Design a protein around this ligand. Structure first.
Ligand SMILES: O=C(O)c1ccc(-c2ccc(Cl)cc2)o1
Ligand SMILES: O=C(O)c1ccc(-c2ccc(Cl)cc2)o1
Ligand SMILES: [Cl-]
Ligand SMILES: [Cl-]
Ligand SMILES: [Cl-]
Ligand SMILES: [Cl-]
Ligand SMILES: [Cl-]
Length: 238
């Protein structure tokens, strides 16, 4: 199953993320206002994945990058060069099998720990713009081989943040989407954004029990609107 994340405009980015969320998850009854909710990922068999086609980096070019995402946990299993028809797969996702593509089993694992080392780039303070997403796209299209390089690791860190982490966290969707406007400002990932991503599992475990503020580690939600403003999609663990 294939979805597009369209970076053409702020509105195309948000609506394409919402379209994915509606297809893979179901809103929580107690955390909904209007058309906006926290949603729980629908259960799928182990190894289920979907594809994300990256589009609209230039407001029709730069259109050969595809991400493979494990559906139950939204981790990025690797990336596909659709021009060469090659799937570069992280070493901890050998259970994800994409037919019809040449699969390269990389020596590098998907963890942020590993990727930040190879990238020599910490996520706290990492900057993302339309320009650096284009640069990241070109790095991934040029990448070949079995071991991730510095430029490809930086590319993955940027793209994972604006796809998988934005799908999870409305806060990250909202702070990055500004970068797609014609003014083209730069998104800076904050320590708070990083804290969110590090707490996704427990947040996913706490929110289904929430009724009518709540706190998980360093993340504090004072009311429903703060929850909705921050979290979009949670794991199915309860
Ligand atoms: O894939 C993950 O990261 C994952 C799956 C389940 C959890 C988790 C972590 C902490 C709590 Cl308290 C509850 C669930 O995390
Ligand atoms: O892309 C965004 O910025 C976005 C889409 C929906 C929301 C939102 C914010 C707060 C509440 Cl209470 C409910 C929904 O924000
Ligand atoms: Cl929603
Ligand atoms: Cl191209
Ligand atoms: Cl690890
Ligand atoms: Cl960091
Ligand atoms: Cl604007």
């Amino acid at each position: 199953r294939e979805f597009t994340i369209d970076f053409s405009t702020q509105q195309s980015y948000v609506s394409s993320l919402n379209s994915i969320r509606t297809e893979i998850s179901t809103p929580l009854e107690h955390i909904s206002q209007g058309t906006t909710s926290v949603s729980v990922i629908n259960h799928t068999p182990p190894g289920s994945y979907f594809a994300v086609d990256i589009r609209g980096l230039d407001v029709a070019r730069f259109d050969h990058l595809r991400l493979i995402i494990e559906q139950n946990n939204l981790y990025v299993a690797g990336f596909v060069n659709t021009a060469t028809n090659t799937f570069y797969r992280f070493s901890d996702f050998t259970h994800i099998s994409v037919p019809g593509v040449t699969t390269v089993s990389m020596t590098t694992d998907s963890s942020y720990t590993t990727l930040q080392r190879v990238a020599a780039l910490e996520r706290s303070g990492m900057q993302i713009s339309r320009h650096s997403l284009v640069s990241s796209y070109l790095a991934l299209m040029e990448f070949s081989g079995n071991t991730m390089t510095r430029d490809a690791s930086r590319a993955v860190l940027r793209f994972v943040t604006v796809t998988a982490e934005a799908l999870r966290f409305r806060q990250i969707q909202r702070e990055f989407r500004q970068a797609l406007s014609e003014t083209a400002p730069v998104y800076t990932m904050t320590p708070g954004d990083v804290d969110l991503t590090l707490n996704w599992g427990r947040i996913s475990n706490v929110l289904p029990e929430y009724r009518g503020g709540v706190r998980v580690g360093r993340i504090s939600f004072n009311n429903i609107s703060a929850i909705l403003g921050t979290v979009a999609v949670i794991l199915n663990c309860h």
